Design a protein around this nucleic acid. Structure first.
Ligand SMILES: Nc1ncnc2c1ncn2[C@@H]1OC[C@H](OP(=O)(O)O)[C@H]1O
Ligand SMILES: [Mg+2]
Length: 756
DNA sequence: ATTCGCAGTTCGC
DNA sequence: CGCGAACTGCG
């Protein structure tokens, strides 16, 4: 089973390393035959002689073109002839690729920005994370001495906890009388002891939570101060720090540094992403938090170190339990994409599709389009029409059925061969024309993307049948994750088409899918309204809520099934409509915002303030509370008697502050921000102090009694002290609760005065 | 660094 | 003032 790839240099020549684990044994494979390359397109072939005489410099030595070879490739489904350019070392191509392009006789170059190690996996058809090899995982965390604003890693590391299948233990250089604490003499020995345990356990995966940005960076600065070789790597190396945009990413050679924070953020949507929130969200059990303050004072005074040691221990134990829950889902994502778990667990959805396509393109001799230059990129700032959102019949409804398309956009991409290499390709005998936008799509051969998207959905359905039959827990759990990851990769092709940074970007393709999506949903609305007497209460893009106004719960169901058989005869190919479920009641406040309860008594909410992170728990709780009543028993009076108790409770300050927190994300550097609302205003003062604010930082603030603009009266919730601060009941009644609950009740005629 | 469509709050002028 | 720009997070 392959883990990662890279390369080193031996006397100027690159050497690929393949890190694998075969039957419990770590192995390094070496390959010195792999030669880097990119392609060139010329006006004349004779120009190859002038480009072979091209030169640049890298490290004092001249870089030349080693070898050339003329190949026929397929570009966007159309035959092209390009010249393959070989070089000695991969670092040669960034030193020289610009000069080939700048040459007059060179029209363009291609496949020049593919990292040598990522390229090795593709051209050799190698797939990481394949097989059932049992990987040894090991989590670790650190506890530090933090002060006001004294520069990063100024203070010492107090404790290093690590957890695995054998348990969670803590290393520290003060005497703590706990059985999982190992005592050493100094901070240096605490780090030496940690290396010793890692080298012993020899883990394949090093699990962290934000080690990309804190743990490894702290250990680096500390080890530089204390003269320590932090040789966590299986080849004796120190962790390499590779920058990715603003952030940083850290790898440990021979192992896989699994940082959980990037994957948890892209996999789950939570108001905050503290280790305590992620744990309770996934496992339904609360994790207690000890703050940097309490740690610093417990160390300097030597008291309550038992509590700090327990916290650091729980930090390692949960990071291990969380690594076990999410590693298999990212192993299958690595198997599917064909890149290492290190690369893939830190990749955006758009970047994931591109690596899948580059592998496939190579499998099919398909030359890849470049990334848009700065200028062509600007052309792609144009937008198109998106989904359809019907003007909803607001209010409360009963006996509702939700009907939705099954894989709307992917089915459209396949049914109509929506693809840049089939878009307006002349000479075909059959075309599918897209409503409104007009684009014609050839259908005499399957297009590049639809073919792959077709092969994926067929792969997905085979997997589902395979896992129902098998009676092996392991095989099923693996297949389940693979089946789940394909559904996600399939639903990313539309967003990819309109993603201006994509190589296979096709604005026409993306708007053809939306146009088809609009035609099918609006056509289906009209068919169920006219041919079957339904009333469509709502519809967002790919589905709709409908009912007969006055019908039995059984009549609406029966007619719903009978209607599904009717339209699915008329729908072409993969386009299918399915019965999502029946709901006894449901409220619809406006477009994008509603909530429904099924039969069994299970609520589900969409778009409402209950879902948003920028609303207090007291506004989300009570909004859920009014809905739970009138959806379970339709009790209008319970919906008002419950608000009137909360507004009084808020007036009498009896409501705990932990339900008054507002969480809004910082989306850019503070220096940019044109308008400074409450969350950035908090960020700014924080940034004026020591703490650094990067795009993605989630600010949790609270509002204290005051006047004027809220930002002045806002503080971070960590600094809230009930003895020195008083929260603004009126803001949370007039801006949080009452606005959220009124919009619902502005259907029984209730008016804001009738509630407070 | 997937797309667009949209509700809704804070804040300046 | 009332409005509109700025901003956020949602499906
Ligand atoms: N992630 C994403 N991005 C952009 N447009 C999207 C995305 N997901 C889904 N849809 C489309 O919206 C309704 C439709 O749902 P289908 O699964 O049935 C999808 O095609
Ligand atoms: Mg639903």
């Amino acid at each position: 089973m392959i883990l990662d790839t890279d390369y080193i240099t031996e006397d100027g020549k690159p050497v690929i390393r393949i890190f694998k684990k075969e039957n419990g044994e770590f192995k390094i494979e070496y390959d010195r035959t792999f030669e880097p390359y990119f392609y060139a397109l010329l006006k004349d072939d004779s120009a190859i002689e002038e480009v072979k005489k091209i030169t640049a410099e890298r490290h004092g030595t001249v870089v030349t073109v080693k070898r050339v070879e003329k190949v026929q490739k397929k570009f966007l489904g159309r035959p092209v002839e390009v010249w393959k350019l070989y070089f000695t070392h991969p670092q040669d191509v960034p030193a020289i690729r610009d000069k080939i392009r700048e040459h007059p006789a060179v029209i363009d170059i291609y496949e020049y920005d593919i990292p040598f190690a990522k390229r090795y996996l593709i051209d050799k058809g190698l797939v990481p994370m394949e097989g059932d090899e049992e990987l040894k995982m090991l989590a670790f965390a650190i506890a530090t001495l933090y002060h006001e604003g004294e520069e990063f890693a100024e203070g010492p590391i107090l404790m290093i906890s690590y957890a695995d299948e054998e348990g969670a233990r803590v290393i520290t250089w003060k005497n703590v009388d706990l059985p999982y604490v190992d005592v050493v003499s100094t901070e240096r020995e605490m780090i030496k002891r940690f290396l010793r345990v890692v080298k012993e356990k020899d883990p394949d995966v090093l699990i962290t939570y934000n080690g990309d940005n804190f743990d490894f960076a702290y250990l680096k600065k500390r080890c530089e101060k204390l003269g320590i070789n932090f040789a966590l790597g299986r080849d004796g190396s120190e962790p390499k720090i590779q920058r990715m945009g603003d952030r940083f990413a850290v790898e440990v050679k021979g192992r896989i540094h699994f940082d959980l924070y990037p994957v948890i953020r892209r996999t789950i949507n939570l108001p905050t992403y503290t280790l305590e929130a992620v744990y309770e969200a996934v496992f339904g059990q609360p994790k207690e938090k000890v703050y940097a303050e309490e740690i610093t004072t417990a160390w300097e005074t030597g008291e309550n170190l038992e509590r700090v040691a327990r916290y650091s221990m729980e930090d390692a134990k949960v990071t291990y339990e969380l690594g076990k829950e999410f590693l298999p889902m990212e192993a299958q994502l690595s198997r599917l994409i064909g890149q290492s778990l290190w690369d893939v667990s830190r990749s955006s959805t758009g970047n994931l599709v591109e690596w899948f396509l580059l592998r496939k393109a190579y499998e099919r001799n398909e030359l890849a389009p470049n990334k848009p230059d700065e200028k062509e990129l600007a052309r792609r700032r144009q937008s198109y029409e998106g989904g359809y959102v019907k003007e909803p019949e607001r209010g409360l409804w009963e006996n509702i059925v939700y009907l939705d398309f099954r894989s709307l956009y992917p089915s459209i991409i396949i049914t109509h061969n929506v693809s840049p290499d089939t878009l307006n390709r002349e000479g075909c005998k059959e075309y599918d024309v897209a409503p409104q936008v007009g684009h014609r799509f050839c259908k005499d051969f399957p297009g590049f993307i639809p073919s792959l998207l077709g092969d994926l959905l067929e792969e997905r359905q085979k997997i589902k049948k395979k896992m129902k039959a098998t009676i092996d827990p392991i095989e099923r759990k693996l297949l389940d994750y693979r089946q789940r990851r394909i559904k996600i990769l399939a639903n990313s092709y539309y967003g990819y088409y309109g993603y201006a940074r994509a190589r296979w970007y096709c604005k026409e393709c993306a708007e053809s899918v939306t146009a088809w999506g609009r035609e099918y949903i609006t056509m289906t609305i009209k068919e169920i309204e006219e041919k079957y007497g339904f009333k469509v209460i709502y519809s967002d893009t790919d589905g709709f809520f409908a009912t007969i106004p006055g019908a039995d719960a059984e009549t609406v169901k029966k007619k719903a099934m009978e209607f599904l058989k009717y339209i699915n005869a008329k729908l072409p190919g993969a386009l299918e409509l399915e019965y999502e479920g029946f709901y006894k009641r449901g409220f619809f406040v406006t477009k994008k915002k509603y909530a429904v309860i099924d039969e069994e008594g299970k609520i589900t909410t969409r778009g409402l303030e209950i879902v948003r992170r920028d609303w207090s728990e007291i506004a989300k709780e009570t909004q859920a509370r009014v809905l739970e009543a009138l959806l379970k028993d339709g009790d209008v009076e319970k919906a008002v008697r419950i608000v009137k108790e909360v507004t009084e409770k808020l007036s009498k300050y009896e409501v705990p502050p932990e339900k008054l927190v507002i969480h809004i994300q910082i989306t850019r550097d503070l220096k940019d921000y044109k308008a400074t609302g409450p969350h950035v205003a908090v960020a700014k003062r924080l940034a004026a102090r020591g703490v650094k604010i990067r795009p993605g930082t989630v600010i949790s603030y609270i509002v204290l009694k005051g006047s004027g603009r809220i930002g002045d009266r806002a503080i971070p919730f960590d600094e809230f002290d009930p003895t020195k601060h008083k929260y603004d009941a009126e803001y949370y009644i007039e801006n949080q609760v009452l606005p959220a609950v009124e919009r619902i009740l502005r259907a029984f005629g209730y008016r804001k005065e009738d509630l407070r």
